[PDB]
Amino acid sequence: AAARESERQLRLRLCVLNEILGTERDYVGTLRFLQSAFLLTEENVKVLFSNIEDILEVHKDFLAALEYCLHPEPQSQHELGNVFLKFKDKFCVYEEYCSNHEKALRLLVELNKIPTVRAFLLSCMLLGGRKTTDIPLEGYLLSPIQRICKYPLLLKELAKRTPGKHPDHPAVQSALQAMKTVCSNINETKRQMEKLEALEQLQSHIEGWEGSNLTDICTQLLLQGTLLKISAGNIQERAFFLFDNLLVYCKRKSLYIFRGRINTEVMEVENVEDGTADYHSNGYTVTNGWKIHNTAKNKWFVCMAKTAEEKQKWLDAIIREREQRESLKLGMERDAYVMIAEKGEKLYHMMMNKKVNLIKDRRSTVPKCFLGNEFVAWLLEIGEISKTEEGVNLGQALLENGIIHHVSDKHQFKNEQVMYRFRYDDGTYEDIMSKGVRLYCRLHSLYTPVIKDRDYHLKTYKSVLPGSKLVDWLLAQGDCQTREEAVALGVGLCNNGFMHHVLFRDESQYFRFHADEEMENDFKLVENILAKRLLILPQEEDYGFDIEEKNKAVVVKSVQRGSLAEVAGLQVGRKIYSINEDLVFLRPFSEVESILNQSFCSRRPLRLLVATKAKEIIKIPDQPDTLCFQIRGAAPPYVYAVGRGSEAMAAGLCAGQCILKVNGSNVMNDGAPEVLEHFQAFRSRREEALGLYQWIYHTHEDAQEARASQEPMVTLTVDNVHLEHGVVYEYVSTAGVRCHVLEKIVEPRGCFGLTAKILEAFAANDSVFVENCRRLMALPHFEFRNICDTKLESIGQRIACYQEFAAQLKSRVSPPFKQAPLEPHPLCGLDFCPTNCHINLMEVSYPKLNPMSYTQHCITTMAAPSWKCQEDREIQDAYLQLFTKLDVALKEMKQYVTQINRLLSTITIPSDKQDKLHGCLEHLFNQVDSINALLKGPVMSRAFEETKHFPMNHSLQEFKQKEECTIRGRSLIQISIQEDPWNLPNSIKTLVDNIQRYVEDGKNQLLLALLKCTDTELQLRRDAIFCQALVAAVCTFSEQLLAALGYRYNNNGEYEESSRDASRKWLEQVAATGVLLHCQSLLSPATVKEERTMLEDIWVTLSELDNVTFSFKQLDENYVANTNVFYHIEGSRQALKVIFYLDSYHFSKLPSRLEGGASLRLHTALFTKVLENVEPGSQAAEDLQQDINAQSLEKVQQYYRKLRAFYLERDQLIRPINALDELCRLMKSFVHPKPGSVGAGLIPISSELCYRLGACQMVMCGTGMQRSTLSVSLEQAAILARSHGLLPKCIMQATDIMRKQGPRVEILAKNLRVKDQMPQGAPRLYRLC
């Protein structure tokens, strides 16, 4: 074996020789190419290259000597030290270039700043054949320093390999000394040599090194440390080393042992949650963790750092490196590509000339074919190129650069006279709608008029634009730098049918937009309508209710007994409007039948509308048998249910109906018994006339309550509620197709039950808190505890008030919404429903029976946070968060303790098992230390200071000195493992439980301080306001998600995107990250102080709202009429986990991930700017506006980074992403007060931005009446123009039809007490026209 060891050393020496040979051959080839292609004023060339020729010749002689030395092939009996010494003097050639290198690199930097000389250098580099993208000139230029610093290393290496019997060792050592002296005499080589020697010393500490040497592909030790990992279902602590394109982890015990390393280019970075545990984590919770991949082993692993700061350091460094290298290589390749395109264009045109015309239609005849031979002869002839190979390689690049191609496209570029063709010959070789829409909006958004009526030929033209002035303004805002940009934009606009001359051009010609031409048919109405959304579900054979034509108006034929339609309350004799959100009153009868058949085969959940009126008269037979319904509320009674399969269906009886009069009897104020007695069944028996009947309930809230607890005609005058003032529109598309913008305004169907359940969750949470606080406090000081108990009684009183509000809000049915208060009064259930909530829908219907498209864009409305009847607050929030973190940490620590105890049981062997246990124990100790620090946080210290007036078995100083005890326990664990692993589990339990006791002490003190520093009035107000905001958010997202599940919602139609894909994509985008809420508050804080304070409150309540989290859980019912989304609440304030219980069809369509109830977060976004003209306190209000906008901009930008990262992890996005980037630039400009001119285009532009994203929309205003309808119609109009082919000639046509004719007048129709007015000084785009 020893002979084999000597033979291995011999092989190593041979390897050193072979690599020396290869390196020298490669270097001389580098010099060969550099001199052959390059050797632009000639002084530049000489200064750059200096003395490469003498160096090249020295290396040539050296290589010849070496080659003869290895003659015929390398062996172990050759000598080279003499060859080295002989050239020792010859290496002074390097000094000249080393000195010149500074000037050469500075000159090359200058040239790089020169595009033409740089591209010329690139062309020359590409000519020869070397792929330029591989290496730039700079590496070749700087190579000599590296080569000279490396030769000593090669000498010493070969000396180490050299067998002792071989006498060349002293000679090689002398040569090494000479090379070191030569390197030293030049200080520039000193830096490279010292870096190399330091790296080699670091490697010398590596035991069992593998792979190429570190100095080869590395230059700097970026970072190092210790970091854990999971692998093969096991854990093994490791220390990672960070070198450029190299991640080196070694098994520390020379202090390091090789385990494995990765190349970054085959490396991936993926981040996980703080609290995840999956198969890749082998069911282990993750802290500060992230995922990496080695595609070589095509397996992943997780890396968990000791702290957050450590993880941040690692991510920052690794990113920085990958970012720099990516940017460098992308820039180089793109510059090369653009240069190829430019040169190809120039030369192609030069060939197109008749002079020595090479492009020709020769022979199947091949039009415009050129021979590579004649092409290259011409290129050389013009002096551009000097070698046939240079040109043929360049033509090969062009063919590969998609500039030319073989006639048959079955060959590459060869010097032969092979037929070749350009992509221009065969013809083989957007941002306007958004640009124009914005352009108009911004321009007319200005305060000081700009786009104005002007006198042309002594006759004023209305609202024209001096193209000169257009360019001047475009430059004024940095929107266009040079007049070329503005002129190009104006040319586009002119061809784009937005503006035209009064009779684009860069002079004083005057232009107005076609929209003002319409101002100074294509958008109209058809009808106005009121509807009730009769959500129906499929039955055994049909969807429940047939139809028939009557008065050429689609009407119901009959409703079959025992129908889900009868569940929803579908009558006979009602005109229909929609069927599957698909219009039918503008369609033939048979077409409506086809729509129904298609929905059946698709088994879709219908979302119809109907033609039922605000009052109805009902005649019911009265047998002396049973009531067949119920009633409740001394307030205007509302039918509370109705039997199924009964004449009550026949008579036209439906849940929720609010009876006003019966047989000509005023009851609207009287109680239930009054109407009850009129029925013979009630006369027979008071309550015993309620025969068994499948009871169908107004809301889930009472359906569940009644169901759990249980386990000769009469005229009626019922006043309905929760109706839908449907409008229609019509217009002819820009594509020419026909459209119906079937707007609606629904009121939030499931609104009450949500306020009820949220207040119930508040009550239960407060009750549990009270129970625990009371128990803890029971066991100066006496009066302190008495004060605490008084606070606790106050909490209980708040709980009772919450319960009473729950009862009330269960009682109320009418009116459908909370009237805006005009007077103060004590609290009441109505105070926690949203103030004037609504859902301004939209649709579309134009074919791609025949195919059709659809969409939606909800826009909810709601007044400012309504209530009339911080430092300590942030302290309290800090306590809340600390408690939550501590408890969660205790839970996960217990889980992991169980995991490790099971592992110890399994330990009950190969040393790798001992080492894995060691690493696991180290992780346990690390988590323990983390928890200890969290306990020791200043929040806890202040808490203890607050609790000093209460007896306790632990003190701040006692806890601090417990650190020594914890260190002792850890050392005792170490002693146990050293002596016997069987003593370890007991110490594990001991420490776990002792620290648990510490935790309980801490949270006791935390709760004590919380009570010690809490006030109830502000908390009650805050809960109210959050309740409103969350109600709005929940209903909004309910609507939008329900849209998605129907395969409707579509926020990107400008890319010919089918609805189905848009729905799936948005839904899963949410499931990955979540949803963003855009609150476009339009309040005027400088106007009313009250609205300013309401703005502050809505802002802070949104900030709190961020914590909310949703999740889904199937839920089945046959006992509610027209609500799929049986909402629910649970959890607490800090994390209120709502459950949008959906139904079976509305559960299958849920993406795969969420089907188990996984958190969807919820991000807030608030933007404020007073629509009317700006005209210290108000300065502070404006500053508040700016801060709100800034924070919201940061949050949206972060979500944008997240979304782009998702998609990149997940081509067509180039358009939307660039447009989004421009939008972000616009927003930054707006919010940034860089040196009124911005007007108010922020509102529309930002609305566009959020709609482009997956965001669900929402808007709040002063009073819900005037300041909001305008903005809403504006946004709807812009969406239409941007998404479904409207004629941008009709923009203001739509903008004014809406704000004058459409649903948005029913806000004033159903509401009269409200007080509001339209804007008085708004820009043109807002004011009515």
Ligand SMILES: O=P(O)(O)O[C@H]1[C@H](O)[C@@H](OP(=O)(O)O)[C@H](OP(=O)(O)O)[C@@H](OP(=O)(O)O)[C@H]1O
């Ligand atoms: O020593 P044994 O008991 O065989 O376990 C080894 C180590 O855990 C390695 O981890 P480390 O690299 O930290 O030393 C791991 O390499 P990876 O982490 O690269 O997967 C091996 O992965 P497999 O070869 O896939 O099992 C695993 O088998």
